[model samples]
Target chain A: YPIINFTTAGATVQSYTNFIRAVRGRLTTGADVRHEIPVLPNRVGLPINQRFILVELSNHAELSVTLALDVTNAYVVGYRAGNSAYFFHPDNQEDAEAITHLFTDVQNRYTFAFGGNYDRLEQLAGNLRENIELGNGPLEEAISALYYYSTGGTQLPTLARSFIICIQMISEAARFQYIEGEMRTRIRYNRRSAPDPSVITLENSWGRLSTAIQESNQGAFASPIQLQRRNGSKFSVYDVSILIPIIALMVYRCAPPP
Target chain B: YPIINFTTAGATVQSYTNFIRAVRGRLTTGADVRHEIPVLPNRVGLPINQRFILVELSNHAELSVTLALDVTNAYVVGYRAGNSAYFFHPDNQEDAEAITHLFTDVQNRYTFAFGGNYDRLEQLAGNLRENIELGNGPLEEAISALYYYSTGGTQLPTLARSFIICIQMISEAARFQYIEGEMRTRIRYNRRSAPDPSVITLENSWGRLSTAIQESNQGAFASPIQLQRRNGSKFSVYDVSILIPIIALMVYRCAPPP
Candidate 1:
């Protein structure tokens, strides 16, 4: 499935760097992605696991796209050096092939989904004005609703989970938008000058989805769900039940073989 | 008869000042002799209304004997200040006088009622200790009980009411003995060089009773019960009564007299 992705262009080098680091660390640790990738050109010589793909736009245009696939045991590490992007992941022949295939499927799915929902997405964006005008104040309720819709039923993949947490933090920070606006206008004039306009204008539906995952999973985003059927054949029962019963039987039966 | 002839010596100069103020104010206001004095000094300058009988102990030695009494019409302000104390009806001057006389009689009947009941008081004091020790804490249950026992009773004359309050506060303060031994010792050390022994002991029963009144009365102790009853009689019998016929009569009488 298309899990988590970030697309940015024409951003300050520092913003790009911080964004890379936040996504990298959170996705790797939070999703339990099994890879170690050197995030800096200087650290290229160090042993590292590679499991990510990075696409750089033409001619130092400050463009980078990060995509997290639904596949387990994989991660992405992105680094920037001298106006060039360097990406790494596990290079195990089979694992590399599997990762590439997964990425291709995820990208294709993402493109299809975006293309199909283009009008709906625009409508949702337009709804923001009404939601704002309704004097609901911040878009917490809308974002939370979107989050609930996205991940209410099924569990999200690892990278998706991390993105959810970042989204939640963003939503919480949005509560202080009035204060932040004052600071930006009066105190930190630089924040208003050529700021990442996309951050201010972009609708945060995707981010809300991520936040839902974070809230649902708590801090346990890295752990895999231990799924088992509630009603099924004895052998098909949940592992916990089987384990407990077997242990009890062994203790009862194996005691002096009585 | 004997009521007017009674004398108390332990009554401090301040206490006498309060009594004089109370008596003079009542006389000037055309208040009846049975009118109770306000418990707080600010109200009528009666801070400690406890009976203080100056008694000759030996040659060139004299001691004050304090007797705790319960009377009517006296403002029985509680431990904390600002709370109104119990008061009897001024219109019921005969009843008020009878009550005051009864209080004096009771004190004489049980001369040791103030100091001699230490054992029984201590047993009651143990209730507080056991409560605190059992982690029940003092605020909710024990403190509430103390509060109810302290002020949740019929109105009394000013002197008798003040006496009860002082005793209650003093006794309760003594019961809270396990509070900080080291702190107490430090306080003692700080005052060691004073001319007098600086008897900084915890409040005895009389002291507690005074404190209870002081705290409850908030320096404005006035008997609410007495006031309510006295105020109740100001209007007609129909004005006071809530009976259907009385209400009907009031409604009819208040209408045009045709």
Candidate 2:
């Protein structure tokens, strides 16, 4: 069957984590989450789902999920979680990459979806990756263990606090990219040394990005906002696209720390 | 062509850990270390060895290693690390299982090689497995993180202390099995009333095993002694057999936390 179903209950947490890990692992490099099983050469399959279902009972409520990707663009066409599920449709390659970038960046985890023009962002990304691999931690227990053993710690903060920081830093990078893409490029080409609202916005955005990059903050860069209007409400297209897996994680109680 | 070589330096620790994890993963079930790649199905392959070699430079000292397993018994017949490598050849299935049990028991991080006689040992093994998966820790930092987050901590100690305790408990289990196998049945069917040194040893071994079982020590069970004379020295056959991989790990600086 194209759609996979699992009916386990005790593994609710593991299922969600595995699903999130799978999505993240699929989209980026250096994530370090492992997921493997046999499948078609091109399309990804959830063999973990099959492995889990073997132990689940038939009497429990079934959870069915499915995903479809466009082979031509390698972009996700649609994925559904469950009741009240949301759908995402990226128009082109840029939109797909940008959508993935927002979520992967906000995950603020080691290694991120790459951008063509922002290789410098990898500085902080690389640090987090090394820290995670080295098991560096910030907690007092982590410190003491490291101190006593003369070894490094692995004290990354819990998910919520890191996520909050990820949100703030990503917002700054969004604005910076906005200024660079729209205003800075336009101003240089315009040949008018005029004081304007756009120039002030560019200054603020550039200053924020500079500070983040200098400080080695989690989000040293972010994808530019992709927006669209469909029925009535204006939507940040990539944000909506990324929110599918995010909300699925939330629904499974694997996100937002309760 | 079957031998793999790697020359990387910074990844020395990872290479060793990955190798240990691979060996352990290959030997037992419920071990969570992940390794995957395409290869022939009959014999276990260290695809990780191939993967690690990809990043190594030609200038560095080379590490060459290989293994060959008997397909019938599924026992490791021979493996080599580098210069001064040791070899193991288990005589039969029981010998192989016992040899594997000692090292895996000493490693005692979680999950274990099974013994035909000790289903009770799985009680402890399963708890350790669950604790690891649940991320329960004993350190103050782990406690606080758990308390604040209302979750669990992952506070497994650095490897050495655990290994020492593992050694002591395995010794007790070994004695218990010695008494059970050699003395208990003989006494039960004997025509003469027993009041001797053998009876005393049986009582002592039984009491120790009970205490360990009640306390849930890491070495609550161990394989019975398998001994043989080889060349000039008498050998506790499986102990020497298990040491091959253990010494390999020691050589790689992945064990004994110096």
Candidate 3:
């Protein structure tokens, strides 16, 4: 059996659900893959708060490829309570850019290899469009459905394994963007006069775009693109207005960037 | 009614005789007048070593003209010895220049007034030269001679009187030169930088000459000549060779000049 393993240690199912939520509309899986959520740390009072996901060919099968997914830190609690809005922080522009860039890369690669399957790919694309409209409240349900179908081999043809590799690459790329965004923001705040904050955020956004394309290709599946045509403009407008203003304010308040 | 006042107070014949030795050359019987020494200070232990000479004029019968002959400070007993071998302190070039200037002034004035009576005038000049040659030891004799001719009308013709006036002027001029030379030398030693000692000496010499000329012109019969010589080259040379080096040493060793 094609096996997909999600290990949650010291974490609640809700936390695991949140990690999936972050990757919703960003990755696609197949239906034949069996996803096991083992209660490994249920006996411990701390519960399983840390989680990892792995996709692998069955142990009995000749193919023994295994990929581990570790969720190091997540914005679980801060999702949507006080600020209830699903908006990217100004500082997260770098991550957004990386995600966008990775998505572009995956899209380019998919177009090159899967040109013959455009009709089926377009169907998957339509599902993504519908999911994005359901808003952040339905994000986890959308992401779970996408992962199941993409890993089941019914959605991704056997010839599209390269796309799966690309998906993993894009996820890794997105992580790098996350790290870079965190570091740049930290450094910008610590030092004085952070000028060129807008430029830096733009660069970071490009990096995030790159990461997003790469992640899509690695997953070998299209995420549910729930294009809340409203929220779609949110990031773009934010990138122009709010992100730039916040960065500009930080730059104005800071001493100077080294 | 020719008044012959012989008022020698407590001085012996020998002391009186020694004093007249320097004045003998400037005296003639018909044209030379003699008078006993004047009143003395009452210091019994110390014999009366000083004397004076007075002359009576026909028009001014009761008012006899007096000349004081002092010997106390005249003997120059400090570093200035009574020896021609002393080489006149080779550094006393400024003093020598001043003395020469005074002599020239006297010679010029006397040459103008006393056309035929060169003999008597030359005799007085010779006495002055002789006294200087004898150094400080003969200062008392010089003072006495100056006193005698200064008061004895018979030895001084109408022109001779002018000569006597010139002699008196030269002597007074020399007195200033002497004082200025001594002051400059003291300054050199005290300041510890013999920088342009000659220029300093020259400044003092000029100052003395100016003072002497000013005082002389103020109706005081002693017609002292004004000495004005501008040695620009010498001054510049002194500025470079002496002043620069001395100033450098002063700056190197101590604080700067005030």
Task: Please provide TM-scores computed only on chain A for all of the candidate models, following their numbering.
Answer: 0.20, 0.21, 0.22
Model 1 error, position B27 (Å) = 35
lDDT of each: 0.25, 0.25, 0.25
lDDT of 3: 0.25
> What is the clash count for each candidate, in the order shown?
55, 12, 67
The iRMS of the candidates, in order, is 33.1, 23.2, 49.5
lDDT of 1 by residue, A147-255 (tens): 3323343222322322232232222122223222322242222232221222222222223322322332111122222222223212221111112211100100111
Q: Model 2: runs farther than 4 Å from truth?
A: A1-176, A188-226, A229-258, B1-121, B124-258
Query: Each prediction's TM-score against the native?
Result: 0.16, 0.16, 0.16
Q: Candidate 1 chain A — worst ten consecutive residues by lDDT sum?
A: A248-257
Worst lDDT run of 10 residues, candidate 1 chain B, spans B246-255
Residues B1-258 of candidate 1 have per-residue lDDT tens digits of: 111111223333343234323332331222221102122122223223431111111111121122222221122212211132222232344434433432333222211122223234334344322122211111112233322333444222222333332332222212222212212332333321111111122222223323322332111122211111112332111111111111100000111111
